[PDB]
Amino acid sequence: IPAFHPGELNVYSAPGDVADVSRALRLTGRRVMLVPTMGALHEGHLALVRAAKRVPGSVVVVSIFVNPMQFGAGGDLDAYPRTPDDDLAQLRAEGVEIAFTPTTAAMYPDGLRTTVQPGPLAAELEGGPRPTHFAGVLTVVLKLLQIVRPDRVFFGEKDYQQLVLIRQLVADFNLDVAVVGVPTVREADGLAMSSRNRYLDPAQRAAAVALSAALTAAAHAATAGAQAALDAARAVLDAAPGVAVDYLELRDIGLGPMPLNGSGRLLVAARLGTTRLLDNIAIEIGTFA
Amino acid sequence: AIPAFHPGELNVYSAPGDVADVSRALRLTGRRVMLVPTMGALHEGHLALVRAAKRVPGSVVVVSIFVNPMQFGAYPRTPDDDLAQLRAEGVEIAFTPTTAAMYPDGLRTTVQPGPLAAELEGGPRPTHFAGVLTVVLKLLQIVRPDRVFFGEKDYQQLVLIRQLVADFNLDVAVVGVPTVREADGLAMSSRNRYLDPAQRAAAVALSAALTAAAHAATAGAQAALDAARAVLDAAPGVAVDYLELRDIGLGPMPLNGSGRLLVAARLGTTRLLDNIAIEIG
Ligand SMILES: O=C(O)c1ccc2c(c1)OCO2
Ligand SMILES: O=C(O)c1ccc2c(c1)OCO2
Ligand SMILES: O=C(O)c1ccc2c(c1)OCO2
């Protein structure tokens, strides 16, 4: 058709359906907000939804799509958590009017043909041993932006490298959307929220606080300079039982071919058993506050 | 404050943000925005593009003029005459950005075309089509046209733009415009003036070969190919790079049905291309 029941959760699977409804809402003056997710929603996703909601006269579109193109072969794709019933229930509770739940076939009818090739940042940090990963992310986000044509698109600072790449996408392709980054939601001990946190047993869950503890220690130590920041983070991680650090890196905020001068981001990735966790924090070098 | 726009006059903007704002504002005033991407040095081929765009009711025509550095290997520039030609066509918007304005962060995020981009013209130039789809995407995003107009002359380019559009869910209609030709059939191109008289006379073999082939095709695909090959074989100094019959999307030619016959050839230093619709049987 498609029908749109205002004040209720409308679920569309067809790209054409959501595109038409979005086009219609935008033509009546409502401002279209997009929150792209892969489902398995937790409270940090709900913060994304809330921030979009607070935009005056917004209509909130939340996409749920476990994008196969951002996964490397092996079992990562099949192993991704799927909790559709909880996801949709959470969106209704939040007063979301639109959930977009496309099929793989609707998204990729010609498989991998035209795709987005990210800049050299895609080859680093998370992309190091996963060199097609961000091409996957950026290909899907580009499509979702073209399908929904939102005014603003909301991402978490949690997957900070991804946020940077998305701002690159938007800049480099002249996309008429505002990219809104939302501060990471944390458990009460500091643990960054993630759909991956379900894979930590009680021992791993206890040990996992070491990531955020290491980052906040570094952010405070940073008055004393970069080395002191990094060493404080390293000390905490080294004190933590069964935390296998992948990388701990201090970068310029754009993550790119510029040196760290003053304002930076400290990024960590670590393994707890088979569970790979990420966190990051703002760092100010020589700044007490 | 939206940049100044004067209806019925050629309005020239170099800033991507400016044409973006004027285009958006215009669409709201009840215009349909038509984009014709060019690399300048305009001839009758481009004018056919412009007239196609103009005839759409409520059209405002955006002609972009940008020599895309990214579609050249890992040139004519007539700005004044270009702009005067557009004025004579009643085109109201020219978009003439700089390389710096188009690539302000340099070459970073780009479009990776599909596997068709490595075939045919992507043989000699394996990065050419990445360069084209990247700039076309950017132009589409800047101008946000209802319809975008490309020639059938660069057929493989046109198919790849159709793939871009489907594959990225772009909200634009791609309009293919038939090749404008010289009096003897030679497909128009700024390259043609480079041919010496001997080459210019032999150059008519590309179109002749294709038209022969289209008419031979009632006897089937192999007759059509053999006919085309015969005409090219009658021409001196025409180095055929390829002659291929494909389906209209440039996949394999099916048993019968619509297809497209494509040819490329070097005459001295000048590469010429042509293509034609073929109906098999
Ligand atoms: O995608 C996430 O796992 C995530 C997790 C936490 C977030 C967030 C996103 O946005 C703001 O807080
Ligand atoms: O020139 C026209 O009369 C005309 C009228 C309607 C058209 C059109 C051309 O292109 C597609 O929609
Ligand atoms: O780009 C060209 O050289 C060209 C040449 C001929 C054309 C055309 C473009 O659009 C339709 O007819």
Side-chain angles (χ1 to χ4, degrees), chain B residues 43 45-46 48-49 150-154 177-180 188-190:
Chain B
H43 50 68
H46 306 104
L49 268 9
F150 292 101
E152 289 184 0
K153 213 211 159 279
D154 290 305
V177 178
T179 303
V180 168
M188 294 193 165
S189 166
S190 57

Side-chain angles (χ1 to χ4, degrees), chain A residues 28 64 104 146 185:
Chain A
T28 66
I64 302 177
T104 294
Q146 300 309 320
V185 186

Side-chain angles (χ1 to χ4, degrees), chain B residues 23-137:
Chain B
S23 172
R24 166 172 269 165
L26 276 174
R27 216 193 169 267
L28 284 174
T29 82
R31 287 266 212 155
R32 290 282 159 279
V33 170
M34 305 295 127
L35 176 67
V36 180
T38 75
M39 302 217 294
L42 313 175
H43 50 68
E44 298 295 320
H46 306 104
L47 304 188
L49 268 9
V50 165
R51 293 152 191 168
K54 271 216 84 193
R55 57 186 259 153
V56 179
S59 59
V60 55
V61 181
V62 189
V63 170
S64 62
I65 302 171
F66 176 62
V67 183
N68 173 26
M70 200 196 156
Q71 76 198 59
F72 289 88
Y75 196 79
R77 284 168 185 87
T78 61
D80 306 278
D81 204 359
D82 287 345
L83 301 179
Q85 279 186 94
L86 306 175
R87 212 166 274 110
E89 295 298 308
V91 164
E92 297 163 294
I93 304 165
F95 173 50
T96 53
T98 54
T99 299
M102 285 297 278
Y103 297 103
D105 299 291
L107 277 196
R108 191 170 58 186
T109 315
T110 62
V111 173
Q112 171 110 288
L116 167 60
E119 304 166 47
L120 306 167
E121 286 309 296
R125 319 190 201 266
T127 63
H128 160 72
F129 286 121
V132 188
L133 266 34
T134 304
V135 67
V136 169
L137 175 62

Side-chain angles (χ1 to χ4, degrees), chain A residues 111-123:
Chain A
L112 288 199
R113 190 167 66 184
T114 317
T115 61
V116 174
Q117 172 65 73
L121 173 62

Side-chain angles (χ1 to χ4, degrees), chain A residues 42 44-45 48 156 158 182-185 193-194:
Chain A
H42 52 62
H45 297 110
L48 296 174
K158 219 283 203 186
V182 179
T184 303
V185 186
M193 276 180 190
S194 170

